[PDB]
């Protein structure tokens, strides 16, 4: 992952941080996703353990517990694509996408 982004296909593991300025999103170990100083949380505290935050190809942030069980969903969706949840410097977590444009320094032709 990226210190302030999460790409669809990537995971914000147990105790994981995404952070930008004074705002600290944590996939805490009480299975609650909390964005600190963001007045907001998944409110899934104690609802499981060894939890993970993921990003689906239709723009959903799904919190899976230790094994495989979903615990929380954004429940906002779009077309199949690459997406991005990012911690906005004004203090929101905002899902973005799908990709409209891509620059690839990793191609010979």
């Amino acid at each position: 992952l990226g210190t302030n982004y999460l790409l669809s296909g990537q995971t914000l593991d147990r105790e994981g941080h995404l952070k930008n300025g004074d705002f600290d999103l944590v996939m805490q170990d009480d299975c609650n996703l909390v964005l600190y100083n963001g007045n907001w949380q998944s409110n899934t505290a104690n609802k499981g353990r060894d939890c993970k935050l993921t990003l689906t190809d239709y723009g959903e942030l799904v919190i899976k517990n230790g094994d495989g069980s979903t615990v929380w969903r954004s429940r906002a969706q779009s077309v199949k694509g690459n997406y991005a949840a990012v911690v906005h410097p004004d203090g929101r977590l905002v899902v973005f996408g799908p990709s409209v444009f891509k620059i690839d320094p990793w191609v010979p032709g």
């Binding site: 990226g2 942030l61 906002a76 973005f96 996408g97 799908p98 444009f101 620059i103």
Partner: protein, 110 residues
């Protein structure tokens, strides 16, 4: 205005006079030579607009178009990308890709 973040360029934000995005071993730079250069990846990249303008500046709009205009607002290069109206962000990802994403289909509060 909107607080810069190192590797993000949200819609509305503007780079120039080699303002630049950074991510580990990469930069994407809206230079002075009016050229948009990505130093990064294996081979890097550029909008290739060396001196095709004067006083240039890169700017992503609220419909996913990433554009270089000059001092008198002439398009010097575009991404020629467009989708719904709203907030988009360009990321300089750790893999060295520079990708645009949007629009905002979910935020944590308004």
């Amino acid at each position: 205005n909107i607080p810069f973040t190192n590797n993000l360029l949200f819609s509305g934000q503007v780079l120039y006079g080699d303002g630049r995005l950074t991510a580990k071993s990469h930069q994407l730079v809206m230079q002075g030579d009016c050229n948009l250069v990505l130093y990064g990846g294996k081979y890097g990249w550029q909008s290739n607009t060396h001196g095709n303008g004067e006083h240039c500046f890169l700017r992503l709009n609220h419909k996913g178009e990433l554009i270089i205009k000059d001092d008198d607002f002439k398009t010097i290069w575009s991404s020629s990308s467009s989708s719904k109206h709203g907030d988009y962000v360009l990321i300089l990802r750790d893999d060295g890709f520079a990708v645009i994403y949007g629009p905002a289909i979910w935020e944590t509060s308004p």
